[PDB]
Coordinates of all heavy atoms in Angstrom, one line a residue:
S20 N 279.2 -2.3 58.5 CA 278.1 -2.1 59.5 C 278.5 -2.6 60.8 O 278.4 -1.9 61.8 CB 276.8 -2.7 59.0 OG 276.8 -4.1 59.3
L21 N 278.9 -3.9 60.9 CA 279.2 -4.5 62.2 C 280.3 -3.7 62.9 O 280.1 -3.5 64.1 CB 279.7 -5.9 62.0 CG 278.7 -7.0 61.7 CD1 279.3 -8.2 61.0 CD2 278.1 -7.4 63.0
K22 N 281.3 -3.2 62.2 CA 282.4 -2.4 62.8 C 281.8 -1.1 63.5 O 282.3 -0.7 64.6 CB 283.5 -2.1 61.8 CG 284.3 -3.3 61.4 CD 285.5 -2.9 60.5 CE 286.7 -2.7 61.4 NZ 286.9 -1.3 61.8
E23 N 280.8 -0.5 62.9 CA 280.1 0.7 63.5 C 279.4 0.3 64.8 O 279.6 0.9 65.8 CB 279.1 1.3 62.5 CG 279.7 1.4 61.1 CD 279.2 2.6 60.3 OE1 278.5 3.5 61.0 OE2 279.5 2.8 59.1
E24 N 278.7 -0.8 64.7 CA 278.0 -1.3 65.9 C 279.0 -1.4 67.1 O 278.7 -0.9 68.2 CB 277.3 -2.6 65.6 CG 276.2 -2.5 64.6 CD 275.0 -1.6 65.0 OE1 274.7 -1.5 66.2 OE2 274.6 -0.8 64.1
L25 N 280.1 -2.0 66.8 CA 281.2 -2.2 67.9 C 281.6 -0.9 68.4 O 281.6 -0.7 69.6 CB 282.3 -3.0 67.3 CG 283.1 -3.9 68.4 CD1 282.1 -4.5 69.3 CD2 283.8 -5.0 67.7
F26 N 282.0 0.1 67.5 CA 282.3 1.4 68.0 C 281.3 1.9 69.0 O 281.7 2.3 70.1 CB 282.4 2.3 66.8 CG 283.1 3.7 67.0 CD1 284.5 3.8 67.1 CD2 282.3 4.8 67.1 CE1 285.1 5.0 67.4 CE2 282.9 6.1 67.3 CZ 284.3 6.2 67.4
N27 N 280.0 1.9 68.5 CA 279.0 2.5 69.4 C 278.9 1.7 70.7 O 278.9 2.3 71.8 CB 277.6 2.4 68.7 CG 277.7 3.0 67.3 OD1 278.4 4.0 67.1 ND2 277.1 2.3 66.3
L28 N 278.9 0.4 70.6 CA 278.9 -0.5 71.8 C 280.0 0.0 72.8 O 279.7 0.2 74.0 CB 279.0 -1.9 71.5 CG 277.8 -2.6 70.9 CD1 278.0 -4.1 70.7 CD2 276.6 -2.4 71.9
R29 N 281.2 0.1 72.3 CA 282.3 0.5 73.2 C 282.1 1.8 73.9 O 282.3 1.9 75.1 CB 283.6 0.5 72.4 CG 284.1 -0.9 71.9 CD 285.5 -0.8 71.3 NE 285.7 0.5 70.6 CZ 286.0 0.7 69.3 NH1 285.7 -0.2 68.5 NH2 286.7 1.7 69.0
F30 N 281.6 2.8 73.1 CA 281.4 4.1 73.7 C 280.3 4.1 74.8 O 280.5 4.7 75.9 CB 281.0 5.1 72.6 CG 282.2 5.7 71.9 CD1 283.3 5.0 71.5 CD2 282.3 7.1 71.7 CE1 284.4 5.5 71.0 CE2 283.4 7.7 71.1 CZ 284.5 6.9 70.7
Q31 N 279.2 3.3 74.6 CA 278.2 3.2 75.6 C 278.8 2.5 76.9 O 278.5 3.1 77.9 CB 277.0 2.3 75.1 CG 276.3 2.9 73.9 CD 275.5 1.9 73.1 OE1 274.7 1.1 73.6 NE2 275.8 1.8 71.8
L32 N 279.6 1.5 76.7 CA 280.2 0.8 77.9 C 281.0 1.9 78.7 O 280.8 2.0 79.9 CB 281.1 -0.3 77.5 CG 281.5 -1.3 78.5 CD1 280.3 -1.7 79.3 CD2 282.2 -2.5 77.9
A33 N 281.8 2.7 78.0 CA 282.6 3.7 78.7 C 281.8 4.7 79.5 O 282.1 5.0 80.7 CB 283.5 4.4 77.7
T34 N 280.7 5.1 78.9 CA 279.8 6.1 79.6 C 279.1 5.4 80.7 O 279.2 5.9 81.8 CB 278.8 6.7 78.6 OG1 278.1 5.6 78.0 CG2 279.5 7.4 77.4
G35 N 278.4 4.3 80.4 CA 277.8 3.5 81.5 C 276.3 3.2 81.1 O 275.5 3.2 82.0
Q36 N 276.1 3.0 79.8 CA 274.7 2.7 79.3 C 274.7 1.4 78.5 O 274.0 1.5 77.4 CB 274.3 3.9 78.5 CG 274.1 5.2 79.2 CD 273.7 6.4 78.3 OE1 274.0 6.4 77.1 NE2 273.0 7.3 78.9
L37 N 275.4 0.4 78.9 CA 275.3 -0.9 78.2 C 274.8 -2.0 79.2 O 275.4 -2.1 80.3 CB 276.6 -1.3 77.6 CG 276.6 -2.5 76.7 CD1 275.5 -2.4 75.6 CD2 278.0 -2.7 76.0
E38 N 273.8 -2.7 78.8 CA 273.3 -3.8 79.7 C 273.8 -5.1 79.1 O 274.7 -5.8 79.8 CB 271.8 -3.8 79.8 CG 271.2 -4.8 80.7 CD 270.7 -6.1 80.0 OE1 270.7 -6.1 78.8 OE2 270.4 -7.1 80.8
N39 N 273.4 -5.5 77.9 CA 273.9 -6.8 77.3 C 275.4 -6.5 76.9 O 275.6 -6.0 75.8 CB 273.1 -7.2 76.1 CG 273.4 -8.6 75.7 OD1 274.0 -9.3 76.5 ND2 272.9 -9.0 74.5
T40 N 276.3 -6.9 77.8 CA 277.7 -6.7 77.5 C 278.2 -7.9 76.6 O 279.2 -7.8 75.9 CB 278.5 -6.6 78.8 OG1 278.0 -7.7 79.6 CG2 278.4 -5.3 79.5
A41 N 277.4 -8.9 76.6 CA 277.6 -10.1 75.8 C 277.6 -9.7 74.3 O 278.2 -10.4 73.5 CB 276.7 -11.2 76.1
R42 N 276.9 -8.6 74.0 CA 276.7 -8.2 72.6 C 278.1 -7.9 72.0 O 278.4 -8.3 70.9 CB 275.9 -6.9 72.5 CG 275.7 -6.4 71.1 CD 275.0 -7.5 70.2 NE 274.8 -7.0 68.9 CZ 274.6 -7.7 67.8 NH1 273.4 -8.4 67.8 NH2 275.4 -7.8 66.8
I43 N 279.0 -7.3 72.8 CA 280.3 -6.9 72.3 C 281.0 -8.2 71.8 O 281.3 -8.2 70.6 CB 281.2 -6.3 73.5 CG1 280.6 -4.9 73.9 CG2 282.7 -6.1 73.1 CD1 281.2 -4.4 75.2
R44 N 281.2 -9.2 72.6 CA 281.9 -10.4 72.1 C 281.3 -10.9 70.9 O 282.0 -11.2 69.9 CB 282.0 -11.5 73.2 CG 283.0 -12.5 73.0 CD 283.0 -13.6 74.0 NE 283.4 -13.1 75.3 CZ 284.5 -13.3 75.9 NH1 285.4 -14.0 75.3 NH2 284.8 -12.7 77.1
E45 N 279.9 -11.0 70.9 CA 279.2 -11.6 69.7 C 279.6 -10.8 68.5 O 279.9 -11.5 67.4 CB 277.7 -11.5 70.0 CG 276.8 -11.3 68.8 CD 275.4 -11.2 69.2 OE1 275.0 -11.5 70.3 OE2 274.6 -10.7 68.3
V46 N 279.6 -9.5 68.5 CA 279.9 -8.7 67.3 C 281.3 -9.1 66.8 O 281.5 -9.4 65.6 CB 279.7 -7.2 67.5 CG1 280.2 -6.4 66.3 CG2 278.3 -6.8 67.9
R47 N 282.3 -9.0 67.7 CA 283.7 -9.3 67.3 C 283.8 -10.6 66.5 O 284.3 -10.6 65.4 CB 284.6 -9.4 68.5 CG 284.4 -8.2 69.5 CD 285.7 -7.8 70.1 NE 286.7 -8.9 70.2 CZ 287.3 -9.4 71.3 NH1 286.5 -10.0 72.2 NH2 288.6 -9.2 71.4
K48 N 283.2 -11.6 67.0 CA 283.2 -13.0 66.4 C 282.6 -12.9 65.0 O 283.1 -13.5 64.1 CB 282.6 -14.0 67.3 CG 283.6 -14.7 68.2 CD 283.0 -15.1 69.6 CE 284.0 -15.5 70.5 NZ 283.5 -16.5 71.5
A49 N 281.4 -12.2 64.9 CA 280.8 -12.1 63.6 C 281.8 -11.5 62.6 O 281.9 -12.1 61.5 CB 279.6 -11.2 63.7
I50 N 282.4 -10.4 62.9 CA 283.3 -9.7 62.0 C 284.3 -10.8 61.5 O 284.6 -10.9 60.3 CB 284.0 -8.5 62.6 CG1 283.1 -7.4 62.9 CG2 285.2 -8.1 61.8 CD1 283.4 -6.5 64.0
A51 N 284.9 -11.6 62.4 CA 285.9 -12.6 62.0 C 285.2 -13.6 61.1 O 285.9 -13.9 60.0 CB 286.3 -13.4 63.3
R52 N 284.1 -14.1 61.4 CA 283.4 -15.1 60.5 C 283.4 -14.6 59.1 O 283.7 -15.3 58.1 CB 282.0 -15.4 61.0 CG 281.5 -16.8 60.8 CD 280.3 -17.1 61.7 NE 280.8 -17.4 63.1 CZ 280.4 -16.6 64.1 NH1 279.6 -15.6 63.9 NH2 280.9 -16.8 65.3
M53 N 283.1 -13.3 58.9 CA 283.0 -12.7 57.6 C 284.4 -12.7 56.9 O 284.5 -13.2 55.8 CB 282.5 -11.3 57.6 CG 281.3 -11.1 58.6 SD 279.7 -11.1 57.8 CE 278.6 -11.5 59.2
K54 N 285.4 -12.2 57.6 CA 286.7 -12.1 57.0 C 287.2 -13.5 56.6 O 287.8 -13.6 55.5 CB 287.7 -11.4 58.0 CG 287.3 -10.0 58.4 CD 288.0 -9.5 59.6 CE 289.0 -8.4 59.2 NZ 288.4 -7.4 58.3
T55 N 286.9 -14.5 57.4 CA 287.3 -15.9 57.0 C 286.8 -16.2 55.7 O 287.5 -16.7 54.8 CB 286.9 -16.8 58.1 OG1 287.4 -16.2 59.4 CG2 287.5 -18.2 58.0
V56 N 285.5 -16.0 55.5 CA 284.8 -16.4 54.3 C 285.5 -15.7 53.1 O 285.9 -16.4 52.1 CB 283.3 -16.2 54.3 CG1 282.6 -16.4 52.9 CG2 282.6 -16.9 55.4

């Protein structure tokens, strides 16, 4: 699920419809936390 959110977030950024850009970094770190566990 998280990986899908990131895909979408990236596409929105490219087009020009993302406000919270901080969301991108947050998602990446979440994915890592999971893989570590």
Side-chain angles (χ1 to χ4, degrees):
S20 82
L21 279 159
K22 288 188 92 269
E23 314 215 5
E24 295 302 320
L25 210 36
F26 193 75
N27 312 318
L28 279 185
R29 291 187 329 237
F30 272 47
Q31 294 160 55
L32 197 45
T34 59
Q36 293 177 335
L37 186 55
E38 184 261 353
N39 196 13
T40 45
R42 179 60 178 163
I43 294 169
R44 198 182 294 256
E45 149 183 345
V46 173
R47 314 217 333 237
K48 267 146 192 210
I50 291 153
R52 215 161 283 116
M53 317 264 161
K54 300 166 107 48
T55 309
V56 175

